[PDB]
Amino acid sequence: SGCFEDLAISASTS
Amino acid sequence: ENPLKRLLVPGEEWEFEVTAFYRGRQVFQQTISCPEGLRLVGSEVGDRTLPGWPVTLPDPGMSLTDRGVMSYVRHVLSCLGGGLALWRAGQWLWAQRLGHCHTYWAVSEELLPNSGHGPDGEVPKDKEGGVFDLGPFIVDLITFTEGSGRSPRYALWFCVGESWPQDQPWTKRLVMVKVVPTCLRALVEMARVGGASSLENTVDLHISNSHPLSLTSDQYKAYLQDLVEGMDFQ
C-alpha cells in the first residue's frame, strides 16, 4: 500500500 | 510452390493479436506486425532505442473501479520498465524480460481454462528464451487432421508481476496478457473445418504479403507435411 505484498518484482537499480 | 512456406520466409512479419486482462477483465486488444517483434510496456514514456513495437498496457483507471486493484495494477505497470519482449526468429517465438516484473508464460487455450494447469516456464532476463516451436505444432496439427482428437495450443499467456495462478483462478491475477499469432489460429481452424462438407476451404494466414488460400483437405495436409520436413528438429 504500503509495501506490495506477494508481487514478483525484483529490486530497482539504475 | 508451397504457399505455407511463406510463414518461414526471411523477412515475413506475422500478425500478433495481443489481449490484456486486469483481474480477468479485458482492458486492451491490438494486432501488431513488426520485424523486431513487440514489447509489452507500462507507459507511453518508455525507452525508444529498444527494438520492437511498444505495446502500452492501458491505465486501470479507465476500466476498473476497485481502488485496491487499480493501485496494485499501476505498480505493476510502473515497474515494467523495458517490458516484455516477444519476437520471432524462424520457426521459434522468443521472449525476454527487460524490466523488473517477473513474467511467467504458458501455451494454452484461447480462453484460460476454469480448472488450471500451471506455467510452462519463467521468461528469462539476462538472456533470450524460446516459448514456442512451430515444428511440433504443425506435427500435432497434422495428427489432428488425421482425427487423432486434440487440436494444438497456440495461445501464449503471460502472467506479469505475479507468480503463475496454480492454486487460484487466472482471474485473480493483476496483469494477464494473451498473445496469439493469428496464423496459428487460422491453421487450426482450417484443420478443424477441413474434415467437413466442403471440397475446398479458405485459410488466411494473416501474414505480410499473403493472399487467402482455398485448399482441399488432402492438399492442405500435404502442404503441412512438406512444411514439416523443411523445418528443424533435434
What distance in Å separates the CA atoms of residue B18 and residue B40, rounded to the nearest whole number? 9
Number of neighbouring beta carbons within 10 Å of residue B223: 19
Experimental method: X-ray
Q: Is the peptide bond before B230 cis (omega within 30 degrees of 0)?
A: no
Chain A residues near residue B175 by CB distance under 8 angstroms: none
Are B184 and B154 in contact by the 8 Å Cβ rule? The answer is: yes
Residue B150, C-alpha cell as written in the block? 486434440
Which of B70, B120, B74, B71 has the alpha carbon at shortest distance from B101?
Answer: B74
What distance in Å separates the CA atoms of residue B69 and residue B216, rounded to the nearest whole number? 50
Residue B148, C-alpha cell as written in the block? 487423432
Domains and CATH numbers, chain B: 1-234 (2.60.200.10)
B79 touches chain A (CB under 8 A): yes
Which of B105, B89, B74 has the alpha carbon at shortest distance from B36?
Answer: B89
Cα nearest neighbour of B175 on chain A:
A7
Are B128 and B96 in contact by the 8 Å Cβ rule? The answer is: yes
Please report the resolution in angstroms: 2.4
Best residue in B78, B97, B101 to probe A by mutation, most A CBs within 10 Å?
B101
Cα-based distances in Å from B66 to B48, B60, B62, B72, B148: 32, 9, 11, 10, 45
Contacts (Cβ under 8 Å, ≥6 apart) of B49: none
Mind telling me how many Å the CA of B102 is from chain A's nearest CA? 5
What distance in Å separates the CA atoms of residue B136 and residue B92, rounded to the nearest whole number? 11
What distance in Å separates the CA atoms of residue B214 and residue B88, rounded to the nearest whole number? 26
Biggest CA pair distance of chain A:
23
Residue B130, C-alpha cell as written in the block? 524460446
